[PDB]
Amino acid sequence: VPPHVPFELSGAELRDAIVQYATNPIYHDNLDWLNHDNPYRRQLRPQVLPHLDYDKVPGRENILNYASLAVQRLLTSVYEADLVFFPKSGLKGKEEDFRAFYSPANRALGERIRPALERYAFGFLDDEVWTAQSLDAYLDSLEQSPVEKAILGSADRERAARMWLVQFAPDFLSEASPMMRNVLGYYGPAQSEWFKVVIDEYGYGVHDTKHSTLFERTLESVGLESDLHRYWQYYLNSSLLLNNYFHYLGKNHELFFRYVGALYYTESSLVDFCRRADHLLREVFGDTVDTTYFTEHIHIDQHHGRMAREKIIKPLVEAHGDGIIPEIVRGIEEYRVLLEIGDFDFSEQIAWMDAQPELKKLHDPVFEGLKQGKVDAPVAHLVEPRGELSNTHCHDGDELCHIVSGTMRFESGLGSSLTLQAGEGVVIKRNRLHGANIESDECVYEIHSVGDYRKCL
Amino acid sequence: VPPHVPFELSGAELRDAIVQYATNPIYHDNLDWLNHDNPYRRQLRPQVLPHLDYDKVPGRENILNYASLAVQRLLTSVYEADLVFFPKSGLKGKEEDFRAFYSPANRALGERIRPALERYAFGFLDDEVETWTAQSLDAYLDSLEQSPVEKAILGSADRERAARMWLVQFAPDFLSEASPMMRNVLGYYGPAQSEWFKVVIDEYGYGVHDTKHSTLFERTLESVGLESDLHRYWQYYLNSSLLLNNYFHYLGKNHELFFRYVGALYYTESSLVDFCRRADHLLREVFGDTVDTTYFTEHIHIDQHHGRMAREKIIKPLVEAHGDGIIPEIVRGIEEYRVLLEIGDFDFSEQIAWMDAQPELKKLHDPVFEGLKQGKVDAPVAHLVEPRGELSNTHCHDGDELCHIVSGTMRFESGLGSSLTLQAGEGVVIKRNRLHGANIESDECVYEIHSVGDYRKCL
């Protein structure tokens, strides 16, 4: 028997493999801000991917850096090759993109880089996070939320709530897809118990009461659309991370017990989430908003937490022993970490959107500070024609964008834009999602990499 | 944007990649004939994988050759990394194998070769299966005696053995019932998604485990003395059984084939009652009162299946929403599946005939062994010497072979419950494409293998 050469992919070969997957034409930059009813096109900004170092895994303090956002976007596209999508208007005239996404090549190229991508995306959780006795003590251990504060306190509550709702589109519109990955196969009575939870989310198979269909009504009632992924460029790093974590747990069955932990915790908190979400949306929108998606779990026992602990966790540790409980605990603790990152990232993004007029004015003192040599900042000189749309991304330090001539639409969130004319500009805050489009025949501008804009004031 | 290098994997690079996947220790030869409640070990015979040509895709006349068997075994193992299994006895003591099967490496190595394995396994269908409209499709759908399995089992020299061999062929499918179909309910698509989910719920007993259909088939197996741990009977799974099961994982994993699965689902539903009626009858005739056929008698009532729904609430809205251009794919799913069924019928009939003929083929060794000694045939011969316990895991050869035992004792295994004891001077004719293996029972065995091709030419 020939020796087994262990799987290995790193360095430049990994970079080339990531670029190879992502240069499929369906992943190239969009010429618009939105995907118009095409579930096969996802913007991965492949032109940047040759220049990222996938081998040095980031810690938590840098997981909102651009390389992390790029990897979350890559991973969502890789996981979703396993999901069935058709356009709302039907497949007609989109068959070419359909076959570019569902192809042997696109699957194999994505699956080859998936281990490296998952190390980059989730490796930081190793540093961030047993008997049956203490386990049942640990689970016994388990107020305005940060999201409520961000939305209710925003200078544009409806814009902030709409930005929040679209973060959930890939999760809620494909509701229970990652959980369904754990029902394939042949194992104990726990398998039918997992299946029961999936069935509830699918509305027992009645499409009108399928939970995804209810969230369609929620989106449409506040003037948003329900086609995936219309708002791809407005998905925060942290929202993709949260969604990706459950596909990670569901696809990789050595993490099955981590998912058992996460299922208990999410079911246990589902009612409080839906009540807060129902309350918040009615506050912001009034009678207009359809919150049926959430009010289907506003009764106190309208969840699966009690059965998750009794008929999933209990039989599994008995059949497989206490060696699995540290994984059950780890799934709970990892999910809680990701939730905190989401709260931080979302609140930061809303504050960044709300501050746009002040940050346009702050361009002036920051620019003057550069003249005075307060910061020795690298400069980039760019010239771009009309319609050259920079798909949304972020930078890892603060940047100053200064318009020499022309007109730029500076995009900072859904419904959040600035028109920058000659002599104007904007302070771009580190890790904030933003993009730009050129709305004059030509635009000449500069990007100064100031690091920390406060040193220029 | 850098230029896109199209995915490419062929020749020696592909051979090395298949070897690299398959040399994971959980895939090495078993020292016994059975896997003993360990669902992470699958025998891929990796030592022979360097010497197969994965680039030349066989046609139908050659899809029971050994390379096709080896690819079916690989593909089953690749697909099943997506399925959850735990040992019946629990995970304690099997954690290392558990993590060897569910690892980033094992998945990534298998997924890299999956395109090439699927071309090898399924490419012949392009030739076996040749614009449409909504009710030219309805005319075609409307257009769709002892069954081959009924004849194979009830015509057998050993009815019970033939039926047990048949039942174990279904273990990977029935014990993971509806797993490939579940692959189609992930995502976000129209009303068809919830109609598909209905069918999945129905084969999983609606989340009640004792009513769940895999548990019913567990009771079938145990009622005739077989076990229901996966994959206990791996070495007795025929090429065609794996091929049929893999075809649905293929359709399920690769959503460009979604409409083929829509067709296949209709055809299997509208065939299910006939199949279950015949299975229930033949098992009762073979085993009597002892056999539990509830798994089958769940579906012995005419029109109590999902076929009408699949036509009305799945096929009809998808054709309206996505256009008539998907109809050739719906038909192709039906026609490709029917080809695979024909192959299964032949392969299983051949295997049972081969098990039943073991006494005669042991005697046929004598006129064939001498026929070679008569200048008659110029057949290559390998001289093999092997120690005790050298269990050759089951495989097949592409031509007839004569096995002659110079000295020692060999257990020659031709099927579940089908064995020969071969001693000095004795031997057996090994028929092309038939599944078999051997174990050395003395502590040394000297024997010879003559590639006679067609043993007829030595008579």
Short mmCIF file of N, CA and C in Angstrom, two decimals, chain A residues 310-419:
data_model
loop_
_atom_site.label_atom_id
_atom_site.label_comp_id
_atom_site.label_asym_id
_atom_site.label_seq_id
_atom_site.Cartn_x
_atom_site.Cartn_y
_atom_site.Cartn_z
N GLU A 310 -33.41 17.48 26.67
CA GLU A 310 -33.91 16.22 27.22
C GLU A 310 -33.75 15.06 26.25
N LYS A 311 -34.05 15.27 24.97
CA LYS A 311 -34.07 14.17 24.01
C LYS A 311 -32.99 14.29 22.95
N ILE A 312 -32.06 15.24 23.08
CA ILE A 312 -30.90 15.23 22.20
C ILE A 312 -29.62 15.17 23.02
N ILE A 313 -29.40 16.14 23.91
CA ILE A 313 -28.16 16.16 24.70
C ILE A 313 -28.10 14.94 25.62
N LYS A 314 -29.18 14.69 26.36
CA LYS A 314 -29.20 13.58 27.32
C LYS A 314 -28.89 12.25 26.65
N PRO A 315 -29.63 11.80 25.63
CA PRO A 315 -29.30 10.50 25.01
C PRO A 315 -27.92 10.45 24.37
N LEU A 316 -27.38 11.58 23.88
CA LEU A 316 -26.09 11.53 23.21
C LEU A 316 -24.94 11.33 24.18
N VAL A 317 -24.95 12.02 25.33
CA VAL A 317 -23.82 11.84 26.24
C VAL A 317 -23.89 10.45 26.88
N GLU A 318 -25.09 9.89 27.00
CA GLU A 318 -25.22 8.53 27.51
C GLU A 318 -24.66 7.52 26.50
N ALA A 319 -25.03 7.68 25.22
CA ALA A 319 -24.58 6.72 24.22
C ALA A 319 -23.09 6.88 23.92
N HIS A 320 -22.60 8.12 23.89
CA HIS A 320 -21.24 8.37 23.43
C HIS A 320 -20.30 8.78 24.55
N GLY A 321 -20.80 8.98 25.76
CA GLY A 321 -19.93 9.25 26.89
C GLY A 321 -19.71 10.74 27.10
N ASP A 322 -19.01 11.04 28.19
CA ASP A 322 -18.82 12.43 28.59
C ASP A 322 -17.71 13.12 27.81
N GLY A 323 -16.93 12.37 27.02
CA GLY A 323 -15.92 12.98 26.18
C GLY A 323 -16.47 13.96 25.15
N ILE A 324 -17.79 13.95 24.91
CA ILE A 324 -18.39 14.87 23.95
C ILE A 324 -18.87 16.17 24.58
N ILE A 325 -18.91 16.26 25.90
CA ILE A 325 -19.50 17.45 26.53
C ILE A 325 -18.62 18.69 26.32
N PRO A 326 -17.29 18.61 26.38
CA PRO A 326 -16.49 19.80 26.04
C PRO A 326 -16.76 20.36 24.65
N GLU A 327 -17.23 19.53 23.70
CA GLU A 327 -17.64 20.02 22.38
C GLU A 327 -19.02 20.66 22.41
N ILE A 328 -19.93 20.10 23.20
CA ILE A 328 -21.23 20.71 23.40
C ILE A 328 -21.05 22.10 24.01
N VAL A 329 -20.21 22.20 25.05
CA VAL A 329 -19.95 23.49 25.68
C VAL A 329 -19.30 24.46 24.68
N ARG A 330 -18.34 23.96 23.89
CA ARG A 330 -17.61 24.81 22.95
C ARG A 330 -18.54 25.38 21.87
N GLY A 331 -19.49 24.58 21.37
CA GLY A 331 -20.46 25.12 20.42
C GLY A 331 -21.28 26.27 20.99
N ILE A 332 -21.62 26.19 22.28
CA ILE A 332 -22.37 27.27 22.91
C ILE A 332 -21.50 28.51 23.04
N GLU A 333 -20.27 28.34 23.53
CA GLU A 333 -19.38 29.46 23.82
C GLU A 333 -18.91 30.13 22.54
N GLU A 334 -18.61 29.34 21.51
CA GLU A 334 -18.21 29.93 20.23
C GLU A 334 -19.34 30.77 19.65
N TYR A 335 -20.57 30.24 19.66
CA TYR A 335 -21.70 31.00 19.15
C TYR A 335 -21.87 32.31 19.92
N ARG A 336 -21.68 32.27 21.24
CA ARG A 336 -21.86 33.50 22.02
C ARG A 336 -20.80 34.53 21.67
N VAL A 337 -19.57 34.10 21.40
CA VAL A 337 -18.53 35.02 20.95
C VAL A 337 -18.96 35.68 19.63
N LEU A 338 -19.40 34.86 18.67
CA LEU A 338 -19.79 35.41 17.37
C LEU A 338 -20.94 36.40 17.48
N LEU A 339 -21.88 36.16 18.41
CA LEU A 339 -22.97 37.09 18.67
C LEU A 339 -22.46 38.43 19.17
N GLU A 340 -21.45 38.41 20.03
CA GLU A 340 -20.90 39.68 20.50
C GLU A 340 -20.21 40.43 19.37
N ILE A 341 -19.49 39.72 18.51
CA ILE A 341 -18.87 40.38 17.37
C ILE A 341 -19.94 41.00 16.49
N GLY A 342 -21.03 40.27 16.23
CA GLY A 342 -22.12 40.82 15.45
C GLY A 342 -22.67 42.10 16.04
N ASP A 343 -22.89 42.12 17.36
CA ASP A 343 -23.43 43.32 17.99
C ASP A 343 -22.47 44.50 17.82
N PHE A 344 -21.18 44.25 17.96
CA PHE A 344 -20.19 45.31 17.82
C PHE A 344 -20.13 45.81 16.38
N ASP A 345 -19.96 44.89 15.42
CA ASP A 345 -19.89 45.24 14.00
C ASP A 345 -21.15 45.99 13.54
N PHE A 346 -22.35 45.50 13.88
CA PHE A 346 -23.55 46.19 13.43
C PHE A 346 -23.63 47.60 14.02
N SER A 347 -23.36 47.75 15.32
CA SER A 347 -23.52 49.07 15.94
C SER A 347 -22.51 50.06 15.36
N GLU A 348 -21.28 49.60 15.16
CA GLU A 348 -20.25 50.38 14.47
C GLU A 348 -20.69 50.78 13.07
N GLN A 349 -21.30 49.85 12.33
CA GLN A 349 -21.70 50.19 10.96
C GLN A 349 -22.80 51.27 10.95
N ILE A 350 -23.77 51.18 11.86
CA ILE A 350 -24.87 52.15 11.89
C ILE A 350 -24.36 53.53 12.29
N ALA A 351 -23.49 53.58 13.29
CA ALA A 351 -22.88 54.84 13.70
C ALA A 351 -22.10 55.47 12.54
N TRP A 352 -21.36 54.64 11.80
CA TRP A 352 -20.62 55.11 10.62
C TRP A 352 -21.56 55.68 9.55
N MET A 353 -22.69 55.01 9.29
CA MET A 353 -23.69 55.54 8.35
C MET A 353 -24.30 56.85 8.84
N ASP A 354 -24.66 56.91 10.12
CA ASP A 354 -25.29 58.10 10.67
C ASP A 354 -24.31 59.28 10.69
N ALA A 355 -23.02 59.02 10.82
CA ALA A 355 -22.05 60.11 10.91
C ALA A 355 -21.61 60.67 9.57
N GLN A 356 -22.10 60.15 8.45
CA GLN A 356 -21.55 60.53 7.14
C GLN A 356 -21.45 62.04 6.94
N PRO A 357 -22.48 62.84 7.21
CA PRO A 357 -22.32 64.30 7.01
C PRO A 357 -21.22 64.90 7.86
N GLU A 358 -21.09 64.46 9.12
CA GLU A 358 -20.01 64.96 9.96
C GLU A 358 -18.66 64.48 9.46
N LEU A 359 -18.59 63.26 8.93
CA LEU A 359 -17.32 62.73 8.44
C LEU A 359 -16.94 63.33 7.10
N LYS A 360 -17.91 63.81 6.32
CA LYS A 360 -17.59 64.61 5.14
C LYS A 360 -16.94 65.93 5.53
N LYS A 361 -17.48 66.60 6.56
CA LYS A 361 -16.87 67.83 7.04
C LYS A 361 -15.52 67.58 7.69
N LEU A 362 -15.36 66.45 8.40
CA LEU A 362 -14.09 66.15 9.03
C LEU A 362 -12.97 65.97 8.01
N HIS A 363 -13.31 65.70 6.75
CA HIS A 363 -12.31 65.70 5.69
C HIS A 363 -11.43 66.95 5.74
N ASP A 364 -12.03 68.12 6.00
CA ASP A 364 -11.26 69.36 5.94
C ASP A 364 -10.15 69.39 6.98
N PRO A 365 -10.42 69.31 8.29
CA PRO A 365 -9.29 69.31 9.25
C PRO A 365 -8.32 68.15 9.04
N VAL A 366 -8.79 66.97 8.61
CA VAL A 366 -7.85 65.87 8.42
C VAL A 366 -6.92 66.17 7.24
N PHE A 367 -7.46 66.75 6.17
CA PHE A 367 -6.66 67.14 5.01
C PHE A 367 -5.62 68.19 5.40
N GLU A 368 -6.05 69.22 6.13
CA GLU A 368 -5.13 70.23 6.64
C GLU A 368 -4.04 69.61 7.51
N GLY A 369 -4.41 68.66 8.37
CA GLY A 369 -3.41 67.97 9.19
C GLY A 369 -2.36 67.25 8.37
N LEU A 370 -2.73 66.76 7.19
CA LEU A 370 -1.77 66.11 6.31
C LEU A 370 -0.84 67.14 5.67
N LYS A 371 -1.38 68.30 5.30
CA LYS A 371 -0.54 69.39 4.81
C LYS A 371 0.52 69.76 5.83
N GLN A 372 0.13 69.85 7.11
CA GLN A 372 1.05 70.20 8.18
C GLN A 372 2.02 69.08 8.53
N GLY A 373 1.96 67.94 7.84
CA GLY A 373 2.83 66.84 8.18
C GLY A 373 2.58 66.22 9.54
N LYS A 374 1.36 66.35 10.07
CA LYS A 374 1.01 65.65 11.31
C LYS A 374 1.09 64.14 11.15
N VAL A 375 0.87 63.64 9.94
CA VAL A 375 0.98 62.22 9.64
C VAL A 375 1.74 62.09 8.33
N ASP A 376 2.74 61.21 8.30
CA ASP A 376 3.40 60.84 7.05
C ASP A 376 2.60 59.70 6.45
N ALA A 377 1.63 60.06 5.60
CA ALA A 377 0.66 59.08 5.12
C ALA A 377 0.88 58.74 3.66
N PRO A 378 1.03 57.46 3.33
CA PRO A 378 1.06 57.07 1.92
C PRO A 378 -0.18 57.58 1.19
N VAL A 379 0.01 57.94 -0.07
CA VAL A 379 -1.07 58.44 -0.90
C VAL A 379 -1.19 57.55 -2.12
N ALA A 380 -2.42 57.39 -2.60
CA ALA A 380 -2.73 56.71 -3.84
C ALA A 380 -3.41 57.71 -4.76
N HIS A 381 -2.97 57.77 -6.01
CA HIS A 381 -3.54 58.68 -6.98
C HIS A 381 -4.33 57.86 -7.99
N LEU A 382 -5.63 58.10 -8.05
CA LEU A 382 -6.54 57.29 -8.85
C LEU A 382 -7.31 58.17 -9.81
N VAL A 383 -7.59 57.62 -11.00
CA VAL A 383 -8.37 58.28 -12.03
C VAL A 383 -9.32 57.24 -12.61
N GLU A 384 -10.62 57.51 -12.52
CA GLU A 384 -11.61 56.50 -12.87
C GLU A 384 -12.73 57.10 -13.70
N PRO A 385 -13.19 56.38 -14.72
CA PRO A 385 -14.26 56.90 -15.59
C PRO A 385 -15.63 56.66 -14.98
N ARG A 386 -16.61 57.37 -15.54
CA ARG A 386 -18.01 57.22 -15.16
C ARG A 386 -18.41 55.76 -15.02
N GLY A 387 -19.15 55.46 -13.96
CA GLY A 387 -19.67 54.13 -13.75
C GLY A 387 -18.69 53.12 -13.21
N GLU A 388 -17.44 53.49 -12.97
CA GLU A 388 -16.49 52.57 -12.35
C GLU A 388 -16.87 52.34 -10.89
N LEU A 389 -17.70 51.32 -10.62
CA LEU A 389 -18.23 51.10 -9.27
C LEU A 389 -17.27 50.22 -8.47
N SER A 390 -16.76 50.76 -7.36
CA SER A 390 -15.95 49.97 -6.43
C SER A 390 -16.91 49.19 -5.56
N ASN A 391 -16.90 47.87 -5.70
CA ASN A 391 -17.78 47.07 -4.89
C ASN A 391 -17.36 47.19 -3.43
N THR A 392 -18.36 47.07 -2.54
CA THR A 392 -18.12 47.39 -1.14
C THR A 392 -17.00 46.51 -0.56
N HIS A 393 -16.26 47.11 0.35
CA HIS A 393 -15.13 46.46 0.99
C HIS A 393 -14.80 47.27 2.23
N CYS A 394 -13.65 47.00 2.82
CA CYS A 394 -13.20 47.81 3.95
C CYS A 394 -11.69 47.87 3.89
N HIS A 395 -11.12 48.74 4.74
CA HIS A 395 -9.68 48.87 4.92
C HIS A 395 -9.30 48.64 6.37
N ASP A 396 -8.01 48.36 6.60
CA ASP A 396 -7.59 47.93 7.93
C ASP A 396 -7.05 49.07 8.79
N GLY A 397 -6.85 50.26 8.20
CA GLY A 397 -6.70 51.50 8.95
C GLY A 397 -7.61 52.57 8.37
N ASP A 398 -7.58 53.75 9.01
CA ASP A 398 -8.38 54.87 8.55
C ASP A 398 -7.79 55.49 7.28
N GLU A 399 -8.66 55.90 6.38
CA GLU A 399 -8.21 56.45 5.10
C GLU A 399 -8.91 57.78 4.86
N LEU A 400 -8.23 58.69 4.16
CA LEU A 400 -8.86 59.94 3.74
C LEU A 400 -9.03 59.91 2.23
N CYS A 401 -10.26 60.06 1.77
CA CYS A 401 -10.54 60.12 0.35
C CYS A 401 -10.73 61.58 -0.01
N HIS A 402 -9.92 62.08 -0.94
CA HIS A 402 -9.98 63.49 -1.35
C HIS A 402 -10.22 63.56 -2.85
N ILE A 403 -11.27 64.27 -3.25
CA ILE A 403 -11.64 64.42 -4.66
C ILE A 403 -10.93 65.65 -5.21
N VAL A 404 -10.10 65.44 -6.23
CA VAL A 404 -9.47 66.54 -6.96
C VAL A 404 -10.46 67.13 -7.97
N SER A 405 -11.05 66.28 -8.81
CA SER A 405 -12.02 66.72 -9.79
C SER A 405 -12.97 65.57 -10.09
N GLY A 406 -14.18 65.92 -10.49
CA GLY A 406 -15.19 64.93 -10.78
C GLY A 406 -16.16 64.80 -9.63
N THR A 407 -16.98 63.75 -9.72
CA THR A 407 -18.06 63.55 -8.76
C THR A 407 -18.15 62.07 -8.41
N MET A 408 -18.15 61.77 -7.11
CA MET A 408 -18.16 60.40 -6.61
C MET A 408 -19.37 60.22 -5.70
N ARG A 409 -20.12 59.14 -5.92
CA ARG A 409 -21.12 58.68 -4.96
C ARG A 409 -20.39 57.77 -3.98
N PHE A 410 -20.33 58.20 -2.72
CA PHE A 410 -19.67 57.43 -1.68
C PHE A 410 -20.74 56.70 -0.87
N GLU A 411 -20.66 55.37 -0.88
CA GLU A 411 -21.70 54.49 -0.35
C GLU A 411 -21.22 53.92 0.97
N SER A 412 -22.02 54.09 2.04
CA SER A 412 -21.57 53.65 3.36
C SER A 412 -22.53 52.65 4.01
N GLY A 413 -23.63 52.31 3.36
CA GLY A 413 -24.62 51.39 3.88
C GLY A 413 -25.84 51.45 3.00
N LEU A 414 -26.80 50.57 3.28
CA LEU A 414 -28.03 50.59 2.49
C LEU A 414 -28.80 51.87 2.79
N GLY A 415 -29.04 52.68 1.75
CA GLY A 415 -29.68 53.97 1.95
C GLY A 415 -28.79 55.05 2.53
N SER A 416 -27.47 54.85 2.53
CA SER A 416 -26.53 55.80 3.12
C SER A 416 -25.48 56.20 2.09
N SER A 417 -25.57 57.42 1.56
CA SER A 417 -24.68 57.84 0.49
C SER A 417 -24.27 59.29 0.66
N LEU A 418 -23.13 59.63 0.08
CA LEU A 418 -22.65 61.00 -0.01
C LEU A 418 -22.31 61.30 -1.46
N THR A 419 -22.60 62.52 -1.89
CA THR A 419 -22.09 63.02 -3.16
C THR A 419 -20.88 63.91 -2.87
#
